[PDB]
Each structure stands twice: as C-alpha cells, then as structure tokens.
Amino acid sequence: VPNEPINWGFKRSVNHQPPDAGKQLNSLIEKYDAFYLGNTKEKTIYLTFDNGYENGYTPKVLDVLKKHRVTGTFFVTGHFVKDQPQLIKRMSDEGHIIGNHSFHHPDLTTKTADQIQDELDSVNEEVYKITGKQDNLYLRPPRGVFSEYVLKETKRLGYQTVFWSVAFVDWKINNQKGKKYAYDHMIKQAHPGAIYLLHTVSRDNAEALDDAITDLKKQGYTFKSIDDLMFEKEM
C-alpha cells in the first residue's frame, strides 16, 4: 500500500506529440516497472490489444498484422483464452506476444496478493496448456484500474505493467461507428513512441487497422513489439 484506486487516463495526443500523464502519475509509474510510452525519440509505434471476448474479427486482425509483418501484443483474459484456444494458438504460432489481462478481469485493487497471484498465473497456465510456451510477463490491469499496492505486488510477482498512450472507443458493441472512425483516430493520435491500445470486437476494425498501418508506414513510422520496447530501452 497505498492502495488508492487510480484509473489510467491522460489528455490525448495533440500535434502528433506524446501525451503526458502528469508529474504525479509519471512518478508512480517510474517508481515501479510500468510505462505508457516507448521510444519517443524515434518514429515508432507499438500496437497492443485487450481481448476479453471474441466478436468475429480477431482472425482478420491477425491476417492484417501478418500481411504488414507487424508484431502485436495481445492482453487476454481467462475467459478469452478458454473460449478461443485456436486464436491464442495463432497469436503464438504467428509471432505475437500474449500479455496478461487477468483471469476474471477483476478490479485488482480489491484483491489480496494471494488472489492477484492466482488471477495472473492462471492465465499463463491456460495459455501454456495451449501453446507449450510463455512470453515475458506483461500486465495490463483490468478496467485500467490500479494503485501503488497493485503496481508493487504485480512487480514483486515479476510483471511489467503496460499502459498506453493511444486509445479510443472501439469497444461499444451497441454503437459500432465503422471503419473511418477508428482509422482517423489512429492517424490523428499518432506520435513518436506511441503505445496503441486496440480492441478487435468492433465492425471494420481490422480494415481500419490495415489502412492505418499502410498510411502510418508511408508517413515514416516503424511498428515494433513490446519486447522490442523492453529490449531496446535496456540497451
């Protein structure tokens, strides 16, 4: 502790400049193994995904990523892994990183270290049953909610907490706005070192991603993985 609830958030990117979470959050972030940006000194973008359930487009998103030769980092829940073992196997077989979004997607600030440990390990246990493998440990808190206690405890458990610097509403099933909506957000919020957080449940999201990668590459951006991000910063 302190175990005061905190929701990851920030004023969105403007002018294609990296957003800032605030002196307050930045401090807590650094204090532990957690980040929301990659290398802001180069024109690089890191794509990450939160996967809690499937709505039919993840296969196309994987096809798109393969086509553009980009490595995604998919933060999955226990329900997602159990409902979609084959997509999980594709993520692994196709070179992507599988991140941890906890088994039951609970608010971790309401959990004991003991519970936290089981919430995270059980996801890897299930992924391993499927893939026979295990990626470096990355955590994206369910609901984007954390606290100093959660950061400390998950860090003590070996996890690197990954937040984001680009996100928009591509998760409302009752109001799926379409291709343009998502594409424009991806183009407009683009900035050096950006860590995108995308979902794969909304209509035309794979097509929007396809176009955004084509156009962002044309703009001079290189897309790297979260492992790349970790290895490079460690250099």
Curated annotation (Swiss-Prot):
Location of the NodB homology domain: 43-224
Residues reported to bind a divalent metal cation: H101, H105
Task: Cite the entry's keywords alphabetically.
Answer: Cell wall biogenesis/degradation, Hydrolase, Metal-binding, Signal, Sporulation
Keyword Cell wall biogenesis/degradation (UniProt): yes
According to the UniProt entry, its GO molecular function terms are:
deacetylase activity; hydrolase activity, acting on carbon-nitrogen (but not peptide) bonds; metal ion binding
> Under which EC number(s) is this enzyme classified?
3.5.1.-
**Family, per entry:** Belongs to the polysaccharide deacetylase family.
Instruction: Name the NCBIfam families on file.
Output: spore_pdaA
From the Swiss-Prot or TrEMBL record, give the protein name: Peptidoglycan-N-acetylmuramic acid deacetylase PdaA
